[PDB]
Design a protein around this ligand. Structure first.
Ligand SMILES: Nc1ncnc2c1ncn2[C@@H]1O[C@H](COP(=O)(O)OP(=O)(O)O)[C@@H](O)[C@H]1O
Ligand SMILES: Nc1ncnc2c1ncn2[C@@H]1O[C@H](COP(=O)(O)OP(=O)(O)O)[C@@H](O)[C@H]1O
Ligand SMILES: Nc1ncnc2c1ncn2[C@@H]1O[C@H](COP(=O)(O)OP(=O)(O)O)[C@@H](O)[C@H]1O
Ligand SMILES: [Mg+2]
Ligand SMILES: [Mg+2]
Ligand SMILES: [Mg+2]
Lengths: 159, 370, 370, 370, 159
């Protein structure tokens, strides 16, 4: 997921920087929570994971607004419809993250890892639906009437 | 305004406001009516007690559940329950709030048609919606790909979903649930000498089941352990000071779920029902359904049901696949939390059944919209 | 600028930039559309998944190949595939790149006319060109004198060429290819008990064919060996953990190429087709065509097809001539590498069908130019 | 002597003597086993009831079909069924009669191998033969050129034959049949309120389907008529005196055949399957296959299936060709009458698999002979 | 079909008359059933059609026996193999006619035109396989070691 953003190099070019920055923050928090899953990471308390999930939800709302602006700026095409579909998915995931974070907070306060497993899963679903929102928004704003490098050569022989 | 989320289950009514994370009103879905003779003037004017005020006064009442196996058998009593929920518990005028009701799959169509008619003609709600319960449980589980075992007091049903696309041909509704386990516990309690026969005594037996009963990981080994020694006996104190003692009935009552032949039912247990629902889905998504077995509903809260169900399914699934059962600690309220997530969505606000649509098309609009 | 080379085969789309040595995008040529019922709001807005995103989500889709036997049956889906290739996979605006498309010989003329019209009116390319696939395979084989067997997923065709002068009367196009072998493998798999019926299960059977199936050098001896002992059985693990075992179906599926009477076709195998194409050419060049049998396309990658084809042709050709089959390890991408060689040539840049010529002469210019 | 003709279908067993025109024994292919507790001494010694004696006592049994989708899943139960057929129903010693068994096309090979082994080692028949069912249906239809749609309880398959020469590459076996329609009728019956869950209640629903269900000529018009008025409602009386009423479920259950997407299957209906099987045959015989559409099997006896299938095929076939569906009134027993015609032929008596041949070559002789 | 027999004019010459008489009876019954199909004919009840079909089957058995005798009298040749093939076809058709006639009789007794359509079809198949049995038997018995006129001249111009 990180590689799809990492091929970005420096409408679009006006709100593009904000969106790429938000996606990068999302990926940073995402691997924060992933490292929590693996055991060693910046955040070690389930409360910290809930705070990180709420942060990802807030970034998702912001990126959704920016991508909606780009989407209505652009012209009718297939990539616009893909972008709108991904925006709906981001909306659903953000709502899930909010309410589930509040529920897990209350459950933890009333008195472990499996509490944060579902939050990590929902945030990972959200992130997967963002790297397809930046690409669709970029293509819809640019190719129709930052940068992404052309894809790498496919191997001729696969062992 | 802010939408209501009334999850009128078969045993408990759980209402609240959309966008929250916990219900405001959680009371049993019973309607008691006094049966003895009133002798003091002025006491006895109230013909029927509803919900929590019929659970306190149950000594002189005949409690009757209006919803029975997820299907509303009595409609006047259920109007009473809804009136209680709206006015006396939540304390909101229904005219200003959309209402999101829940319903088990594969119920009669007259059930949805009459819930819609009652909401739009008796309570005058501005909009409504009827949502399947396992879909809402998957909403509240934080995923979009799983198979949702949703027990309860009325029914026990599965809904396999892969990435937001439910598979309606693999929905397996079983009519074995908490109330059948309560009745079976009464039956097997008659062995020790304790005879509970009345409705208030059904409620006492329900409390015994909640407090003491658990699910055995290995049934035969646990029966052998219970017969060999008295280490499994636990005591409960009845409302009149008597003390009972159930040692072997603790795991025999919830074993009815995995062997429905205990109560004379033919169908397979919940483990075989879940596995059959999995292998009715397309071959490519069975691996993703195996790893997300969301369990919901009250009846799935017996101590040790997740481990036992994982053991039972793992013996059926291929040796390679990874089986893990998801049992959130709040799973009793998973359906309602899913209702909060669904009703408060920005995308969802175009899917309410508005009153104007009901006026145009009658109560048969709920089949098109929902 | 730099020219595109889009080799839209019948089963796989392989695009890239001219002058390179490997494609950038290699994805299946399928367009799935969901068939189940969506229950979560916001999931299910996308009507159709194209290419690699329909191969991951195939559990809930009906995959449909737009190109069928090298002939584009569905044009809206193929516009979807081309849009995917240009924008989402290669990530280039088509307005700035000439495009070199490929096509099997002896196809309908409306096929070229509509590919040209779609490229010049929907994607607004500045130039294009449609090249026969076996000519490009001979380009990429590093020769100018050979007979190019070019199997694939749609068709299997020969083009005999002697020193840059193709012989159009000896081009033998056979409509037996990889997809017919997949369907025959499904048919013969029904014998063991395994029934694959859906489209996603066609893709599973295709993967079985790629992983396990091979070509027998001597068919009768291999059938005797497979019946006598279980040394030929190999196991495959399905996406839901089940394990299958095919012992005799391994070389029976690719034997359809050499005996097309297995699937009810009358025509002769690929060995007799190649030999008949050789002895339709002039007598002086048959010796040079015998020694250069370039094999291309995906379907010619079964383990042991070069040895078997050499054995089959050597039994037909005169005892004096030297038969040797050229099977490069990269032969799956030989057509595209030939497209890279052709499109990047200094001599070739006067042979593009420029947009001005299309405006003057309409879509019938492709028959004159190509 | 005189040969037996045992047409062990997936739902009914129809046995008799070769040369006759009607079976002697026609009983369901079920094997019930009691599940309740026996309390009277001497009653309950019999462990399993087979066929007609398990259909009378079904109130206290779990009926289990041994054949499931034309493939014999349970072999001990099927030995029980064959023993019943030979001794208790036909009342013949198998040692003195050759037996002609029937089998759907494209079944596993182990199926034929184990039927042959059981007949030659357990029942000691002197000879046997296994014949495809649609070939026998074409025998009994009095022709030699037709396409035989043969529904049933297990499978639905076509076999196109032109002048005694079957086309094995155009045989299209579909696994949608009467039992899937019974299960779908149970599912859609849950809408009205009636819940049939047990196996005996599967048999009640099967009887409802046989008595009431029919096929609509135009589905949308019939749905509109059923929704507008109650002229389509017909009542059925259950074995305990209750009366049900199904108005819209009458033509929705058999519509699954023409739209197999009702039960989640992807494949095309029986009309498109027949048309695809026709246009896989050689071009010269499609005119003769269009005019002889022999329909067989039990499931093709819904009132109005011939007219609907003719309407559906005529919309697919070219406007010139003459489509007519042949639906004999006895088509439920067409396969067995074909078995009588085949087994009693003078020419056929050299084609039995004699016991000496089985001793020489083992159970793999059935693949060579049949 | 009638024309192929009608070119007969008066081993073979010992059993030939029996075979030609049987074939003529077959054709007479065949057009009886054909006229039943067209509406007007000697026989008007489906029971009559079933009786006619059984009669044709009996004649088929008799002609099969006679042609088998001629076939084993004759010498090895290609026409003998054609004759044996046609005899097998006649056997199959006769068995079909018998059993299907009994089945249709029972169906009609338990309580229309389509009932007799298949019987007419099978009898017509039987008749087509007889006019090729008389010719093959005649040639095998005579030309190798009644009469049939030489074939008519083919048109030079076909309009
Ligand atoms: N802690 C518990 N342990 C075991 N069973 C329980 C527990 N809590 C509730 N139940 C059972 O679950 C039922 C309540 O389920 P509920 O969540 O109300 O489902 P619904 O809302 O669909 O009625 C009760 O009848 C009770 O028998
Ligand atoms: N390693 C392999 N072994 C056998 N068959 C293969 C292999 N790889 C691909 N195929 C077959 O070749 C087909 C792909 O051929 P492809 O190179 O895409 O031709 P085209 O580009 O003309 O469609 C697939 O359908 C598959 O059946
Ligand atoms: N009159 C009828 N109308 C509709 N369906 C029928 C009728 N009779 C039988 N069937 C269906 O056909 C099935 C029996 O088919 P059958 O002739 O036994 O096929 P097989 O012998 O191959 O099992 C039953 O399961 C029933 O569902
Ligand atoms: Mg519930
Ligand atoms: Mg190719
Ligand atoms: Mg049958």
């Amino acid at each position: 997921i990180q590689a799809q953003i990492d091929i970005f190099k420096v409408k679009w070019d006006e709100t593009g920087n904000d969106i790429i920055s938000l996606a990068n923050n999302m990926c940073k928090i995402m691997m924060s929570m992933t490292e929590f899953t693996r055991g060693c990471g910046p955040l070690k308390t389930t409360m910290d994971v809930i705070r990180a999930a709420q942060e990802i939800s807030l970034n998702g709302s912001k990126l959704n607004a920016l991508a909606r602006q780009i989407g209505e700026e652009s012209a009718d095409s297939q990539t616009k419809k893909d972008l709108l579909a991904y925006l709906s998915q981001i909306t659903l995931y953000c709502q899930q993250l909010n309410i589930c974070s509040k529920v897990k907070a209350d459950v933890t306060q009333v008195g472990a890892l499996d509490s944060a497993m579902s939050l990590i899963q929902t945030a990972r679903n959200l992130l997967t639906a963002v790297v397809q929102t930046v690409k669709a928004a970029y293509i819809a704003s640019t190719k129709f009437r930052w940068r992404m490098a052309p894809p790498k050569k496919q191997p001729l022989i696969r062992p | 305004t802010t939408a209501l989320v009334c999850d009128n289950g078969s045993g408990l009514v759980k209402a609240g406001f959309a966008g929250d994370d916990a219900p405001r009103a959680v009371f049993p879905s019973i309607v008691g009516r006094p049966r003895h003779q009133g002798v003091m003037v002025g006491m006895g004017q109230k013909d029927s007690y509803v919900g929590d005020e019929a659970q306190s006064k149950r000594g002189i009442l005949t409690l009757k559940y209006p919803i029975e196996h997820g299907i509303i058998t009595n409609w006047d009593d259920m109007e009473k329950i809804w009136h209680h929920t709206f006015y006396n518990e939540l304390r909101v005028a229904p005219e200003e709030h959309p209402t999101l009701l829940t319903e088990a799959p594969l119920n009669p169509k007259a059930n949805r048609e009459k819930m819609t008619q009652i909401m739009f003609e008796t309570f005058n709600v501005p909009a409504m919606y009827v949502a399947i319960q396992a879909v809402l449980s998957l909403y509240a589980s934080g995923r979009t790909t799983g198979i949702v075992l949703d027990s309860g007091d009325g029914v026990t049903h599965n809904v396999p979903i892969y990435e937001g696309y439910a598979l309606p041909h693999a929905i397996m509704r079983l009519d074995l649930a908490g109330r059948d386990l309560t009745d079976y516990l009464m039956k097997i309690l008659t062995e020790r000498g304790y005879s509970f026969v009345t409705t208030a005594e059904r409620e006492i037996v329900r409390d015994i089941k909640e407090k003491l009963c658990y699910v055995a990981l290995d049934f035969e080994n646990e029966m052998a352990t219970a017969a060999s020694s008295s280490s499994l006996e636990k005591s409960y104190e009845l409302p009149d000071g008597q003390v009972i003692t159930i040692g072997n009935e603790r795991f025999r009552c919830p074993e009815t779920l995995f062997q429905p032949s205990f109560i004379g039912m033919e169908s397979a247990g919940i483990h075989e029902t879940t596995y059959n629902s999995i292998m009715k889905c397309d071959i490519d998504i069975r691996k993703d359904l195996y790893a997300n077995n969301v369990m919901s509903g009250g009846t799935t809260m017996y101590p040790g049901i997740a481990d036992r169900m994982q053991k039972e399914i793992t013996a059926l699934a291929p040796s390679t696949m990874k089986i893990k059962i998801i049992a959130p600690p709040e799973r009793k309220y998973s359906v309602w939390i899913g209702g909060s997530i669904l009703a408060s969505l920005s995308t969802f606000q175009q899917m309410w059944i508005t009153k104007q649509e009901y006026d145009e098309a009658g109560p048969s609009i709920v089949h098109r919209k929902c």
